[PDB]
Structures are given as structure tokens and as C-alpha cells.
Amino acid sequence: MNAPDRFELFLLGEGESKLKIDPDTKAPNAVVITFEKEDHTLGNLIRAELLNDRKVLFAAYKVEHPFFARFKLRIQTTEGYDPKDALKNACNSIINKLGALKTNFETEWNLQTL
Amino acid sequence: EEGPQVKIREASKDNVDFILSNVDLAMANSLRRVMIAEIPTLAIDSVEVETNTTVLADEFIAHRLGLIPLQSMDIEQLEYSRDCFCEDHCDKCSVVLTLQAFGESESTTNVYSKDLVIVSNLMGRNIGHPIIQDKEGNGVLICKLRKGQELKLTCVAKKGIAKEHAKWGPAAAIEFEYDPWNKLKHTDYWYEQDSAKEWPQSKNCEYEDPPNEGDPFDYKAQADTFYMNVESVGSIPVDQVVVRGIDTLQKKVASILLALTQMDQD
Amino acid sequence: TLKYICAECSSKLSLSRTDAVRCKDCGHRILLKARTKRLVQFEAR
Amino acid sequence: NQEDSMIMNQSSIDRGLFRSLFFRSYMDQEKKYGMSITETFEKPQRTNTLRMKHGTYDKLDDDGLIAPGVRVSGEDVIIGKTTPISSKRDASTPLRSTENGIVDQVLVTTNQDGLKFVKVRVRTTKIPQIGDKF
Amino acid sequence: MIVPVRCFSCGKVVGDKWESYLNLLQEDELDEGTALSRLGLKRYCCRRMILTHVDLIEKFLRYNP
Ligand SMILES: [Zn+2]
Ligand SMILES: [Zn+2]
Ligand SMILES: [Zn+2]
């Protein structure tokens, strides 16, 4: 009766960009991206992979309220390394592990019985 | 092959017990979530009812209809109705099916999901057929009729995501376990006299080496191996729940990549 | 106007006003209206 | 889930956990006074019959009552009745302001004085929302 | 009412388990735990879905209308 529709968790709305990038005004060379219509599924995966990049000083995400499918990613990189690239290499890195994971699973499946 | 590593232990129409070596915790988790809430499926999502002189209420039935697992193998070539250009539904983004039941006998007439009859044009796509793992071939007991009772209704199955309703889950239950000797000290076992004698041994302990008291705490170690078991409802074979899961996760990681390029424009 | 299926009995009495109660062959009053034609939809959720 | 509140599995809810049917019965009757006075069940028309409700009567069949299929909501008139005071005055029965649902059954019968009277019963399914006591 | 089509806990297909359950009981004299196991209802959530269930429909059909 006051409930939001359930598509509102994955469907974007009236002019809501998927990513929103804002210059962090606390530390230098840091940025805080807002991910509309996403959650721990994505956030935890991007943050954990950003923590393997050894030129990333700081990386953490957070769902400010569970009512809303959205989360903030905060990223700080070493001087000269633009944080967006730190995000980009991060995503790609995941995608490559995932692909390898898929094929590796397939070949394993194609060897079974029942 | 290269990175993350799979090792089936058991396989079946309904289950894949495996081991997922060389992966982040985060990824092995994010995969299980996606497997639960984000691989799409077809399921009844509208019921127009013509006659229901049955003991049950309209929507009460409508509800169970939603829960009946429909074949979703070729789902990727059906469309989201919200995306389709046609007004309401069509034969390119929705399967329509019919249910007719009338009690003839003196004995109670049952209505199964076998009694569901596809009507719209599947056009070759492997879609919409109610899953039946039942042994006598009538999976799922929709409703029961007395003598003069009738039930006549029409259901439009749509492509949906479990995030939006748990009907559209291919999921069921996903088993998941790492570090079966707490060698990472990720829990602190509650006990009364003895942690070891009181907590039972995980079946995944024949697969790892028990720690030695002659050894101190390995603090550098991370979570590496992961013992999953994906069970499927059947609207998608098992192997596919995991694959499409990895596919979808990857797919949505990607739209983030693309979205970064969309912003760069002047 | 319009049709009223007998209660304890099975029928389709279409009697109107000034016809009053009750039913046909049954003898008992108590009439239930019959389902509409303008069919309704249900989200299957 | 602090201070005697709780967290419910939204997923399992969809499977129909703690779902209830909810039936409400409305009831009305033709006058109770006079020898040349009788309230009538009908779908009135706002023409010289002013004193009507805000809600639409459009769901009323000719006899003044809904049919057991129609969704109703807001202040939909459900039972149409006019009290003819010397053209008419309205005495129709709006569906509860805060409720909404689908007409389940309509009972038209006479009463022990030979009064025509009616029992309309509406049906809602109610799914466990935030703030529901368990 | 009637056998829930899916278990709430995880939502496992059980709606097609009801008759088979009732047969395992009476036809071949099994006990409910064994009966529930033969139906491959292992995990205890979807297990109680069947054991704890009451078929009120059998009563509802009793009424003529
Ligand atoms: Zn369409
Ligand atoms: Zn009769
Ligand atoms: Zn379960």
C-alpha cells in the first residue's frame, strides 16, 4: 500500500544514470562513484578486486539503506593513476576470471555421467 | 585452463557438487547470489479467469500458477514484455497457456500442471512447457474439484528475474562451504567442554589436511577453496544455472564498463 | 436482470424485481448473484 | 530486528509464507418505515437525486449491486439505494475508504418482514508487510 | 488448504510430492521420516513443508454448492 514496485531494484528510473562520479573532497586523488540499481552482488566483487591492484590506496563500498538498491564505491589511487582506470582494470580483471571460470566449468561438465 | 578452477565431484539432472579453486571469496559469493536472484526465467505472471467454481479463491490459485516451473531453456530468445514494442503481450515475449478442468467423476478430480496447455506460438523456442519430474507424469497439484466444479482460466507466462519475485528463481538451495577445519579462524566455536567432540565433522574434511598442533597460526593464508552444490528446480538444467550465473554476473560487470565509456563523451 | 444461481440448489434463475423470492423448484429463498462477465486479471505474485 | 521487531525473509514470503485471505461483508436493507415509503435498491443518477457519494457508481448493475467479479477500491459505491423523500435521497454504501479488493459474493434475500435486503462480501489477500505483528 | 507448490524456506518443488507422500505412508506402510526421505526431501526446511501440512481442501469439497 506504501510498498515500492519490485522492478525498482533493477530498472533505472526517470533520468537516473547508472554510474555517478564525484571528486572526493576529503583526501586527494580520490573518488566516490554511486551505483544505482545494484547491491552487494556487484559492490563486494568490485571492491575485493580493487584490493589486489597494488596502486590502489583505498577501496570500500556501502549500502546506505537496504530499502534502496544502490551503493557507494570510494576509491583512492596513487599519484598519477586516475581512479577510473583503477575501476576499469578492476572490472575487466573480474570478467576475465569469470570467463575462464565458465570454460573451466564447461570442460569439467562434459566429462561426467548422470 | 588458467585462473579459477572447477572440479565436479557429483553430477545429476538436478545437482552439481563441485569445488571452485583459486577464486576470491567475493567472486565465489557474488556468483551464488547471482545464481539465486538474477538468471532470468519464464513463469506465469498473469491469470485471466473465466470460471472458478472451485473450493479455492481466484488469486489463491493465480498464486500457485506463478509457482509452477515452466521450461526456460531457450529463455534468452524470449523478450521482456517491458522491452517489447507490442502493446501488452505478444508471441515474441510471452507464452500463453490454457487450463480447463471440470469434475466429471464422483471421485475427486485433481488438476495437475500436466493439464496446462500451451496456446501461443512458441515458434520453435524451447520454452513454457511445465517441468514435470513427477514419477507418474503429473507434476504439481494445482487444485482439487468436487462433482459439479469447473475452473477455466488463461495464463500469460513472462520472462522474469527472481529479484522481482521468487517464482522466477531457477535456484532452490545452494550449498556453500570453505575452510572445513577453521584453519583461517573465521568462526570461534561455541562449546561446553570440547569444540572438536561437540561440533560434527564437515564431509569436506576428507578433502583437506587437518592442522597440526605442532604448527602455529597461518595468518597470511586466505580463503581459496570453496565447496558448493547447486540444486536446480528444473526450468533450466543444473549445469546452466551455474554457467548462466557466471554469464550474468560477467554480463552485469560489463554494463558498468560500458557505462564508463558512455560518460566520457563531451 | 440478471441471473441468480440458487444457493442450496443449482440453477440460473434470471428472475427480476417484483418477482421477489425465492427460487425455482427449490422453494427456499437466499439467492447468490452470479460471476460477472468482464473478466479480471491477477498478477501471479 | 531490535527492540521486539523482526526481519522476515522477503523471498520466502513470495512463496506464500504467512499469507491470509481477508473477507469483509457489507449489509443493507430496504427501509423500515411507512406504508407508502420504501427505500429502493437501484443505481441512482445524479440528476435531481443530488446527495450522492464522491465515488463512481459505475460498478453498480441495474439492480443497484456489484457483480461478484468486479475489483473495487477507494470509495467505490457497492450497494446503491435511494430513500424517496417528499425526487430522492442517496443511501448508498461505499467500500471502506482504506480498503480495496474484489467482490466475492452477493446475497440478495428477503427479511422476516418481507424486506428485501442484501449482503455484499469483498475479498482481499493480505501479504505480510513491514510492521505486521507476529 | 492444499499442498504448497513450493517450499518457503528455499522454495523447492514439493507441490508434486503430496500424493506420492500419502502413498508411501499407507500403501507400503513406511514411516513419515522415511517417506519424506524417499521423496528426496532431504534438507529439513522443505521437509517440514510436507510433514506439517494439513489438507483442508478434502474438507472443503465436502460442501455441495
Ligand atoms: Zn510483446
Ligand atoms: Zn434452487
Ligand atoms: Zn526448503
Distance CA A74, CA B34 (A): 23
DSSP letter (8 states) at residue A30? E
Distance CA D70, CA C39 (A): 8
Phi and psi, residue B183, nearest 5°: -60, -10
Instruction: Say whether the peptide bond before residue C22 is cis (omega within 30 degrees of 0).
Output: yes
Which ligand approaches the C-alpha of residue E12 most closely?
3
Which CATH number does the domain housing residue C11 bear? 2.20.28.30
CATH code for the domain defined by D20-127: 2.40.50.150
Q: Give E1-29 as a 3 state SS string.
A: CCCCCECCCCCCECCCCHHHHHHHHHCCC
Distance CA B164, CA A63 (A): 19
Q: Looking at chain C, how many residues does it have?
A: 45
- Chains with 3+ CB–CB pairs under 8 A to B are A, C, D, E
Element at A49 (helix H, strand E): helix A40-50
Question: Which domain does A16 fall in, by range?
Answer: 1-114
Question: How many structural domains does chain C have?
Answer: 1
DSSP letter (8 states) at residue B185? -
Count of Cβ atoms closer than 10 Å to residue D44 Cβ: 24
Distance CA A76, CA B227 (A): 34
Question: Which domain does C26 fall in, by range?
Answer: 1-45
CATH 1.10.10.60 fits E1-65, yes or no: yes
Residue B205 marked in a binding site? no
Which residues on chain B are in Cβ contact (under 8 Å) with A9? 163-164
- For chain E, the structural domain boundaries read 1-65
- Angle CA(B258)–CA(B22)–CA(A44) in degrees, nearest 5? 45
Compute the Cα dihedral for E47, E51, E52, E58 and give only its sign.
positive
Give how far C35 is from chain B: nearest CA, Å. Answer: 8
Centre of ligand 2 to C-alpha C34, Å, is 14
Which residues on chain A are in Cβ contact (under 8 Å) with B28? none
Q: Is D4 a catalytic residue?
A: yes
Give how far E64 is from chain B: nearest CA, Å. Answer: 8
Distance CA B30, CA E57 (A): 42
Count of Cβ atoms closer than 10 Å to residue B1 Cβ: 14
Residues of C (3-42) whose Cβ lies below 8 Å from D? 4, 17, 20-22, 29-40
Which CATH number does the domain housing residue A75 bear? 3.30.1360.10
- For D16, the closest chain E residue by CA position comes to E8
Method: X-ray
DSSP letter (8 states) at residue A6? G
Distance CA B104, CA B184 (A): 65
CATH code for the domain defined by B1-40+167-266: 3.30.1360.10
Cβ neighbours of residue D119 under 8 Å, at least 6 residues apart? Answer: D25, D26, D27, D106, D107, D109
Q: Looking at chain D, how many residues does it have?
A: 134
E strands, chain C, in order = 31-32, 41-42
Supply B174's cell numbers.
545452494
Give how far C11 is from chain B: nearest CA, Å. Answer: 12
Q: May I ask the CATH architecture of the domain B41-166?
A: Beta Complex (2.170)
Distance CA A18, CA B239 (A): 31
Q: Check D4, D62, D63, D104 and give the catalytic one.
A: D4
E strands, D33-127, in order = 40-41, 71-73, 77-79, 81-83, 89-90, 93-94, 100-111, 115-126
